[PDB]
Amino acid sequence: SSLSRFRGCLAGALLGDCVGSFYAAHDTVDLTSVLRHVQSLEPTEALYYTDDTAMARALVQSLLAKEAFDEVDMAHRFAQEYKKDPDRGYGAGVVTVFKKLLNPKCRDVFEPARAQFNGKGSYGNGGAMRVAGISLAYSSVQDVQKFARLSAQLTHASSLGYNGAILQALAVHLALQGESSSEHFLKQLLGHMEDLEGDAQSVLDARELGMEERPYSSRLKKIGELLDQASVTREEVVSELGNGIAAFESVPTAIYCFLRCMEPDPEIPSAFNSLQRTLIYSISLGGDTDTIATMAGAIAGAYYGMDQVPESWQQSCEGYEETDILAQSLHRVFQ
Ligand SMILES: NC(=O)c1ccc[n+]([C@H]2O[C@H](COP(=O)([O-])OP(=O)(O)OC[C@H]3O[C@@H](n4cnc5c(N)ncnc54)[C@H](O)[C@@H]3O)[C@@H](O)[C@H]2O)c1
Ligand SMILES: [Mg+2]
Ligand SMILES: [Mg+2]
């Protein structure tokens, strides 16, 4: 059901953040060691969430409070959540946005993000790490892109930053539509990114800024190559897609993890379901594990639904009940 997919999406995102952060802090990022310690996930709420979930919650609470996108409300919810708990693991640059939004003199909630990094904007993955709720609030693809972009621009004004958020939101949107081949899923995403990155003002800006042409489209094409490739190794995935804090080096990677893990992996025991396998695999890539896993888990959770959210894993996660209530509320309000 759509309710099951809404609940699965937000639970999967929470699992990716909580389980990913557990392994990141224990310096356990290779597959054998992840599998060795799955018992630590208790197969009380022992796994803390990070800034990924803190911002995801604030984004969803803003949409529910206004039953619409309100940039002032959402920006203030982000800044107030930072002020309440600044120690969740926020990016070093984005804290400047929050501090500016907390200034009473601030008159334009989008200006701080535009001023980041000498006026070029952040390219980090923070706009995408929190975006899944957009695709629960907005069922139409045009609205998904519109509000993924706007919500990301509150902190991430560069096209790499906000187009990464759009791509992640589109992947969650597509996953909510149910069963698909990997090929069809990837082709749909590629078609949307080609439209967005082929736009005249966009490819001109990529020219004057020295960037490469159609960056996300190129990486989605690389994903299709990897999905057809024999004996793909972690080193090839990381070398070709990245595992970094930049949206460009993490959003495609998360999507690859979802697509690859739609099929069994001989290196991951078959006792794990498809959502679990996706999370385990994503964490084994290392790098920015909490954000790659939160994004892969949001897509996988929307796709597989609550039936694949293991109670023992879910109940180990800080705030899993509030996360589930928010998912059900989004369904009641917007569906
Ligand atoms: N293991 C990790 O990498 C790790 C662990 C905890 C938290 N984080 C945090 O870092 C990631 C990104 O967060 P965010 O995008 O909200 O924070 P952000 O401050 O907007 O960007 C994060 C970092 O990327 C760099 N950066 C981004 N844009 C530019 C630019 N235009 N020029 C030069 N450098 C730039 C810079 O080092 C900045 O601090 C998230 O995963 C967040 O959780 C990362
Ligand atoms: Mg984090
Ligand atoms: Mg992170």
CSV table of C-alpha atoms and ligand atoms in Angstrom, one decimal:
chain,number,residue,atom,x,y,z
A,1,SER,CA,0.0,0.0,0.0
A,2,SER,CA,1.0,3.6,-0.3
A,3,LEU,CA,0.9,3.9,3.5
A,4,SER,CA,3.3,1.0,3.8
A,5,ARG,CA,5.6,2.7,1.3
A,6,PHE,CA,5.5,6.0,3.1
A,7,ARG,CA,6.3,4.4,6.4
A,8,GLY,CA,9.0,2.2,4.8
A,9,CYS,CA,10.7,5.2,3.1
A,10,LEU,CA,11.1,7.2,6.3
A,11,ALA,CA,12.1,4.1,8.3
A,12,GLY,CA,14.6,3.1,5.7
A,13,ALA,CA,16.1,6.6,5.7
A,14,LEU,CA,16.3,6.5,9.5
A,15,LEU,CA,17.9,3.0,9.4
A,16,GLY,CA,20.5,4.2,6.9
A,17,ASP,CA,21.4,7.2,9.1
A,18,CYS,CA,21.5,5.3,12.4
A,19,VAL,CA,23.1,2.0,11.2
A,20,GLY,CA,25.5,3.9,8.9
A,21,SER,CA,26.6,6.2,11.7
A,22,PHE,CA,27.2,3.3,14.0
A,23,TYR,CA,29.6,1.7,11.6
A,24,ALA,CA,31.3,5.1,10.7
A,25,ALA,CA,32.1,5.7,14.4
A,26,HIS,CA,33.3,2.1,15.0
A,27,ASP,CA,35.7,2.4,12.0
A,28,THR,CA,34.0,-0.7,10.5
A,29,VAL,CA,33.4,0.0,6.8
A,30,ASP,CA,34.5,-3.2,5.1
A,31,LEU,CA,31.8,-5.8,4.3
A,32,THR,CA,33.2,-8.6,6.4
A,33,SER,CA,33.3,-6.4,9.5
A,34,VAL,CA,29.8,-5.0,8.9
A,35,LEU,CA,28.5,-8.6,8.6
A,36,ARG,CA,30.5,-9.6,11.7
A,37,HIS,CA,28.8,-6.9,13.8
A,38,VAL,CA,25.1,-6.9,12.6
A,39,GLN,CA,24.3,-8.4,16.1
A,40,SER,CA,25.2,-4.9,17.5
A,41,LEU,CA,22.1,-3.7,15.7
A,42,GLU,CA,20.0,-6.0,18.0
A,43,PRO,CA,18.5,-8.3,15.3
A,44,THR,CA,15.9,0.4,23.9
A,45,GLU,CA,16.8,2.9,21.1
A,46,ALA,CA,20.5,2.4,21.1
A,47,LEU,CA,21.4,3.9,17.7
A,48,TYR,CA,21.5,7.7,17.6
A,49,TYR,CA,20.5,9.6,14.4
A,50,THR,CA,22.6,12.4,13.0
A,51,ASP,CA,22.0,15.7,11.1
A,52,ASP,CA,20.6,13.7,8.2
A,53,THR,CA,17.5,12.7,10.2
A,54,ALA,CA,17.4,16.0,12.2
A,55,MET,CA,17.0,18.0,9.0
A,56,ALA,CA,14.7,15.4,7.4
A,57,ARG,CA,12.4,15.6,10.5
A,58,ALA,CA,12.4,19.4,10.3
A,59,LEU,CA,11.6,19.4,6.6
A,60,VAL,CA,8.6,17.1,7.1
A,61,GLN,CA,7.4,19.0,10.2
A,62,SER,CA,7.4,22.2,8.1
A,63,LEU,CA,5.4,20.6,5.3
A,64,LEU,CA,2.9,19.2,7.8
A,65,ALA,CA,2.6,22.5,9.8
A,66,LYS,CA,1.7,24.5,6.7
A,67,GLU,CA,0.3,21.7,4.5
A,68,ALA,CA,2.5,23.3,1.8
A,69,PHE,CA,6.0,24.6,1.2
A,70,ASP,CA,6.8,27.8,3.2
A,71,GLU,CA,10.4,28.7,2.9
A,72,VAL,CA,10.3,31.0,6.0
A,73,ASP,CA,8.8,28.2,8.2
A,74,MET,CA,11.2,25.6,6.9
A,75,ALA,CA,14.3,27.7,7.2
A,76,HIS,CA,13.3,28.7,10.8
A,77,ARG,CA,12.7,25.0,11.6
A,78,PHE,CA,16.2,24.1,10.3
A,79,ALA,CA,17.8,26.9,12.2
A,80,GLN,CA,15.9,26.2,15.4
A,81,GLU,CA,16.8,22.5,15.3
A,82,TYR,CA,20.4,23.4,14.8
A,83,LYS,CA,20.2,25.8,17.7
A,84,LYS,CA,18.6,23.2,19.9
A,85,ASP,CA,21.1,20.5,19.1
A,86,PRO,CA,24.1,21.8,17.1
A,87,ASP,CA,26.1,18.6,17.8
A,88,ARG,CA,24.4,16.1,15.5
A,89,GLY,CA,27.2,16.1,13.0
A,90,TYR,CA,26.4,19.0,10.6
A,91,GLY,CA,28.7,20.0,7.8
A,92,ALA,CA,31.3,22.6,8.7
A,93,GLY,CA,30.0,25.1,6.1
A,94,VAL,CA,26.2,24.8,6.5
A,95,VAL,CA,26.4,26.0,10.2
A,96,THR,CA,27.0,29.5,8.7
A,97,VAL,CA,23.6,29.4,7.0
A,98,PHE,CA,21.9,28.5,10.3
A,99,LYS,CA,23.7,31.2,12.2
A,100,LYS,CA,22.6,33.8,9.6
A,101,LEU,CA,19.0,32.6,9.6
A,102,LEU,CA,19.0,32.9,13.4
A,103,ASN,CA,19.9,36.6,13.1
A,104,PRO,CA,16.7,38.7,13.7
A,105,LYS,CA,17.9,41.0,10.9
A,106,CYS,CA,17.7,38.3,8.3
A,107,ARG,CA,15.1,39.3,5.7
A,108,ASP,CA,15.5,36.7,3.0
A,109,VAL,CA,15.8,33.1,4.0
A,110,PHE,CA,17.5,32.1,0.6
A,111,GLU,CA,20.4,34.7,0.8
A,112,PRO,CA,22.6,32.9,3.3
A,113,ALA,CA,22.8,29.8,1.1
A,114,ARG,CA,23.6,31.9,-1.9
A,115,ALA,CA,26.6,33.5,-0.1
A,116,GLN,CA,28.2,30.2,0.9
A,117,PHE,CA,31.7,29.5,-0.5
A,118,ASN,CA,32.4,32.9,-2.1
A,119,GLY,CA,28.9,33.2,-3.5
A,120,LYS,CA,29.0,29.9,-5.4
A,121,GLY,CA,26.9,27.8,-3.0
A,122,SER,CA,27.5,24.5,-1.3
A,123,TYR,CA,27.8,21.4,-3.4
A,124,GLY,CA,27.5,19.1,-0.3
A,125,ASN,CA,24.9,16.3,0.0
A,126,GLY,CA,23.0,18.0,2.8
A,127,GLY,CA,20.2,19.2,0.5
A,128,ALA,CA,19.7,15.6,-0.7
A,129,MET,CA,20.2,13.8,2.6
A,130,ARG,CA,16.9,15.2,4.0
A,131,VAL,CA,14.8,15.5,0.8
A,132,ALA,CA,12.8,12.2,0.8
A,133,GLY,CA,9.8,13.7,2.6
A,134,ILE,CA,9.3,16.0,-0.5
A,135,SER,CA,8.3,13.0,-2.5
A,136,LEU,CA,5.8,11.9,0.2
A,137,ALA,CA,4.2,15.3,0.3
A,138,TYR,CA,4.1,15.9,-3.5
A,139,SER,CA,2.8,13.1,-5.8
A,140,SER,CA,3.4,14.9,-9.1
A,141,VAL,CA,6.8,14.7,-10.7
A,142,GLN,CA,6.7,18.5,-11.5
A,143,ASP,CA,6.1,19.3,-7.8
A,144,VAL,CA,8.8,16.9,-6.7
A,145,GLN,CA,11.4,18.7,-8.7
A,146,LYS,CA,10.1,22.1,-7.8
A,147,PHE,CA,10.1,21.6,-4.0
A,148,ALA,CA,13.2,19.4,-3.9
A,149,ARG,CA,14.9,22.3,-5.5
A,150,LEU,CA,13.4,25.0,-3.2
A,151,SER,CA,14.0,23.0,0.0
A,152,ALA,CA,17.6,22.3,-1.0
A,153,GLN,CA,18.3,25.9,-1.8
A,154,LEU,CA,17.6,26.9,1.8
A,155,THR,CA,21.2,25.5,2.4
A,156,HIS,CA,22.5,24.5,-1.0
A,157,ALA,CA,22.5,27.1,-3.7
A,158,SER,CA,24.9,25.5,-6.2
A,159,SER,CA,23.3,23.5,-9.0
A,160,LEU,CA,25.4,20.5,-8.0
A,161,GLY,CA,23.8,20.8,-4.6
A,162,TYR,CA,20.2,21.3,-5.6
A,163,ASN,CA,20.2,19.0,-8.6
A,164,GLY,CA,21.6,16.3,-6.4
A,165,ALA,CA,18.6,16.9,-4.1
A,166,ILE,CA,16.2,16.8,-7.1
A,167,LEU,CA,17.8,13.5,-8.3
A,168,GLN,CA,17.4,11.9,-4.9
A,169,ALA,CA,13.8,13.1,-4.6
A,170,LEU,CA,13.0,11.8,-8.1
A,171,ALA,CA,14.4,8.4,-7.1
A,172,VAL,CA,12.2,8.3,-4.0
A,173,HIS,CA,9.2,9.4,-6.1
A,174,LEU,CA,9.9,6.6,-8.6
A,175,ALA,CA,10.3,4.0,-5.9
A,176,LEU,CA,6.9,4.9,-4.5
A,177,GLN,CA,5.4,3.8,-7.8
A,178,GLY,CA,6.2,0.2,-7.0
A,179,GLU,CA,7.8,-2.7,-9.0
A,180,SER,CA,10.2,-1.8,-11.8
A,181,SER,CA,13.2,-3.2,-13.6
A,182,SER,CA,16.5,-1.5,-12.7
A,183,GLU,CA,16.8,-0.5,-16.3
A,184,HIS,CA,13.5,1.3,-16.4
A,185,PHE,CA,14.1,3.0,-13.1
A,186,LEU,CA,17.5,4.3,-14.2
A,187,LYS,CA,16.2,5.4,-17.6
A,188,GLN,CA,13.5,7.5,-16.0
A,189,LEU,CA,16.0,9.2,-13.8
A,190,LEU,CA,18.4,9.8,-16.7
A,191,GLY,CA,15.6,11.3,-18.8
A,192,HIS,CA,14.8,13.8,-16.0
A,193,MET,CA,18.4,14.8,-15.4
A,194,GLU,CA,19.1,15.2,-19.2
A,195,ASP,CA,16.1,17.6,-19.3
A,196,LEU,CA,17.4,19.6,-16.3
A,197,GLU,CA,21.1,19.6,-17.3
A,198,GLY,CA,20.4,20.2,-21.0
A,199,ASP,CA,18.6,23.5,-20.3
A,200,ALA,CA,20.2,26.4,-22.0
A,201,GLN,CA,20.9,28.6,-18.9
A,202,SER,CA,22.2,25.5,-17.1
A,203,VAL,CA,24.8,24.3,-19.7
A,204,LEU,CA,26.0,27.8,-20.2
A,205,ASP,CA,26.6,28.2,-16.4
A,206,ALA,CA,28.5,24.9,-16.4
A,207,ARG,CA,30.6,26.3,-19.3
A,208,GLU,CA,31.6,29.6,-17.6
A,209,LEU,CA,32.2,27.8,-14.3
A,210,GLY,CA,34.6,25.2,-15.7
A,211,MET,CA,32.3,22.3,-14.7
A,212,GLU,CA,31.7,19.3,-16.8
A,213,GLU,CA,28.6,19.1,-19.0
A,214,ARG,CA,25.5,17.3,-17.6
A,215,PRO,CA,27.3,15.9,-14.5
A,216,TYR,CA,24.4,13.8,-13.0
A,217,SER,CA,23.4,12.5,-16.5
A,218,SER,CA,26.9,11.3,-17.0
A,219,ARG,CA,27.0,9.6,-13.7
A,220,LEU,CA,23.7,7.9,-14.3
A,221,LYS,CA,25.1,6.6,-17.6
A,222,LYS,CA,28.1,5.3,-15.6
A,223,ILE,CA,25.6,3.5,-13.3
A,224,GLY,CA,24.0,1.7,-16.2
A,225,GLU,CA,27.5,0.6,-17.4
A,226,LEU,CA,28.3,-0.7,-13.9
A,227,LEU,CA,25.0,-2.6,-13.6
A,228,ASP,CA,25.9,-4.5,-16.8
A,229,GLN,CA,29.5,-5.1,-15.7
A,230,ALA,CA,31.0,-8.4,-14.6
A,231,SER,CA,32.6,-8.7,-11.2
A,232,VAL,CA,32.1,-5.1,-10.1
A,233,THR,CA,34.4,-4.4,-7.1
A,234,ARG,CA,33.9,-1.8,-4.3
A,235,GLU,CA,37.0,-0.1,-5.6
A,236,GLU,CA,35.5,0.3,-9.0
A,237,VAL,CA,32.2,1.7,-7.6
A,238,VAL,CA,34.1,4.2,-5.4
A,239,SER,CA,36.5,5.2,-8.1
A,240,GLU,CA,33.7,5.8,-10.7
A,241,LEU,CA,30.8,7.1,-8.5
A,242,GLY,CA,32.5,8.3,-5.3
A,243,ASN,CA,31.6,8.0,-1.7
A,244,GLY,CA,32.1,11.6,-0.6
A,245,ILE,CA,30.3,14.5,1.1
A,246,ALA,CA,29.6,16.1,-2.2
A,247,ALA,CA,26.2,15.5,-3.7
A,248,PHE,CA,27.8,14.5,-7.0
A,249,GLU,CA,29.9,11.8,-5.2
A,250,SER,CA,27.1,10.4,-3.1
A,251,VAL,CA,23.6,10.7,-4.6
A,252,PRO,CA,24.4,8.6,-7.7
A,253,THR,CA,26.2,6.2,-5.4
A,254,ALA,CA,23.1,5.7,-3.3
A,255,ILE,CA,21.0,5.1,-6.3
A,256,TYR,CA,23.5,2.5,-7.6
A,257,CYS,CA,23.3,0.8,-4.2
A,258,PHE,CA,19.5,0.6,-4.5
A,259,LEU,CA,19.6,-0.6,-8.1
A,260,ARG,CA,22.4,-3.2,-7.6
A,261,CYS,CA,20.8,-4.6,-4.5
A,262,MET,CA,17.5,-5.3,-6.3
A,263,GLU,CA,19.2,-8.6,-7.0
A,264,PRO,CA,20.9,-11.0,-4.6
A,265,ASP,CA,24.6,-10.4,-3.8
A,266,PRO,CA,26.6,-13.6,-3.1
A,267,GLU,CA,28.7,-11.7,-0.6
A,268,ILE,CA,25.7,-10.8,1.6
A,269,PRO,CA,23.9,-13.7,3.2
A,270,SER,CA,20.5,-14.5,1.8
A,271,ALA,CA,18.9,-14.3,5.3
A,272,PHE,CA,19.0,-10.5,4.8
A,273,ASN,CA,16.1,-9.1,3.0
A,274,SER,CA,16.5,-6.6,0.1
A,275,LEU,CA,16.3,-3.5,2.2
A,276,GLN,CA,18.8,-4.9,4.7
A,277,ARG,CA,21.1,-5.9,1.8
A,278,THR,CA,20.9,-2.4,0.3
A,279,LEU,CA,21.9,-0.9,3.7
A,280,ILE,CA,24.7,-3.4,4.3
A,281,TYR,CA,26.1,-2.9,0.8
A,282,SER,CA,25.9,0.9,1.0
A,283,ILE,CA,27.8,1.0,4.3
A,284,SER,CA,30.5,-1.3,2.9
A,285,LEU,CA,31.5,1.4,0.4
A,286,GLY,CA,32.8,3.5,3.2
A,287,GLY,CA,33.2,7.3,2.9
A,288,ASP,CA,30.1,9.3,3.9
A,289,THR,CA,28.3,6.2,5.1
A,290,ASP,CA,25.5,7.8,7.0
A,291,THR,CA,24.4,10.0,4.1
A,292,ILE,CA,24.9,7.4,1.4
A,293,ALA,CA,23.0,4.8,3.5
A,294,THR,CA,20.2,7.3,4.5
A,295,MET,CA,19.6,8.1,0.8
A,296,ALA,CA,19.8,4.4,-0.4
A,297,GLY,CA,17.6,3.4,2.5
A,298,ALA,CA,15.0,6.1,1.7
A,299,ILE,CA,14.7,4.8,-1.9
A,300,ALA,CA,14.7,1.1,-0.8
A,301,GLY,CA,12.2,1.7,1.9
A,302,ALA,CA,9.8,3.4,-0.5
A,303,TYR,CA,10.3,0.5,-3.0
A,304,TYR,CA,10.1,-2.5,-0.6
A,305,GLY,CA,7.7,-1.0,2.0
A,306,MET,CA,7.3,-1.7,5.7
A,307,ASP,CA,7.2,-5.4,5.2
A,308,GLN,CA,11.0,-5.3,4.7
A,309,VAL,CA,11.7,-3.0,7.6
A,310,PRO,CA,12.9,-5.4,10.3
A,311,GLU,CA,11.4,-4.6,13.7
A,312,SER,CA,14.6,-5.4,15.5
A,313,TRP,CA,16.6,-3.0,13.4
A,314,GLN,CA,13.9,-0.3,13.4
A,315,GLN,CA,13.3,-0.4,17.1
A,316,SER,CA,17.0,0.2,17.7
A,317,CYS,CA,16.8,3.6,16.1
A,318,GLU,CA,16.4,6.8,18.0
A,319,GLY,CA,13.0,8.3,17.3
A,320,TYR,CA,11.7,5.5,15.1
A,321,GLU,CA,8.1,5.9,16.5
A,322,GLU,CA,8.1,9.7,15.8
A,323,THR,CA,9.5,8.9,12.3
A,324,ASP,CA,6.7,6.5,11.7
A,325,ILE,CA,4.1,8.9,13.0
A,326,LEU,CA,5.4,11.6,10.6
A,327,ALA,CA,5.2,9.1,7.7
A,328,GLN,CA,1.6,8.3,8.5
A,329,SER,CA,0.8,12.0,9.0
A,330,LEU,CA,2.3,12.8,5.5
A,331,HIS,CA,0.1,10.1,4.1
A,332,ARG,CA,-3.0,11.4,5.8
A,333,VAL,CA,-2.4,15.0,4.9
A,334,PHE,CA,-1.1,14.8,1.4
A,335,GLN,CA,-2.5,11.5,0.0
B,1,LIG,N1,31.7,11.0,7.0
B,1,LIG,C1,31.3,12.2,6.5
B,1,LIG,O1,31.7,12.6,5.4
B,1,LIG,C2,30.4,13.0,7.3
B,1,LIG,C3,30.1,12.6,8.7
B,1,LIG,C4,29.2,13.5,9.5
B,1,LIG,C5,28.6,14.5,8.9
B,1,LIG,N2,28.9,14.9,7.5
B,1,LIG,C6,28.2,16.1,7.0
B,1,LIG,O2,28.8,16.5,5.7
B,1,LIG,C7,27.9,16.1,4.6
B,1,LIG,C8,27.5,17.4,3.8
B,1,LIG,O3,26.7,18.2,4.7
B,1,LIG,P1,26.2,19.6,4.1
B,1,LIG,O4,26.1,19.5,2.6
B,1,LIG,O5,24.9,19.9,4.7
B,1,LIG,O6,27.3,20.6,4.7
B,1,LIG,P2,28.1,21.7,3.8
B,1,LIG,O7,28.9,22.6,5.0
B,1,LIG,O8,27.2,22.5,3.0
B,1,LIG,O9,29.2,21.0,2.9
B,1,LIG,C9,30.1,20.1,3.6
B,1,LIG,C10,31.5,20.5,3.1
B,1,LIG,O10,31.8,20.3,1.7
B,1,LIG,C11,32.7,21.3,1.3
B,1,LIG,N3,32.1,22.1,0.3
B,1,LIG,C12,30.7,22.2,0.0
B,1,LIG,N4,30.5,23.1,-1.0
B,1,LIG,C13,31.8,23.6,-1.3
B,1,LIG,C14,32.2,24.6,-2.2
B,1,LIG,N5,31.4,25.3,-3.0
B,1,LIG,N6,33.5,24.9,-2.2
B,1,LIG,C15,34.4,24.3,-1.3
B,1,LIG,N7,34.0,23.4,-0.5
B,1,LIG,C16,32.7,23.0,-0.4
B,1,LIG,C17,33.2,22.0,2.6
B,1,LIG,O11,34.3,21.3,3.1
B,1,LIG,C18,31.9,21.9,3.5
B,1,LIG,O12,32.2,22.0,4.9
B,1,LIG,C19,26.7,15.4,5.2
B,1,LIG,O13,27.0,13.9,5.1
B,1,LIG,C20,26.7,15.8,6.6
B,1,LIG,O14,26.1,14.8,7.5
B,1,LIG,C21,29.8,14.1,6.8
B,2,MG,MG,25.1,12.8,9.1
B,3,MG,MG,27.0,12.1,6.4
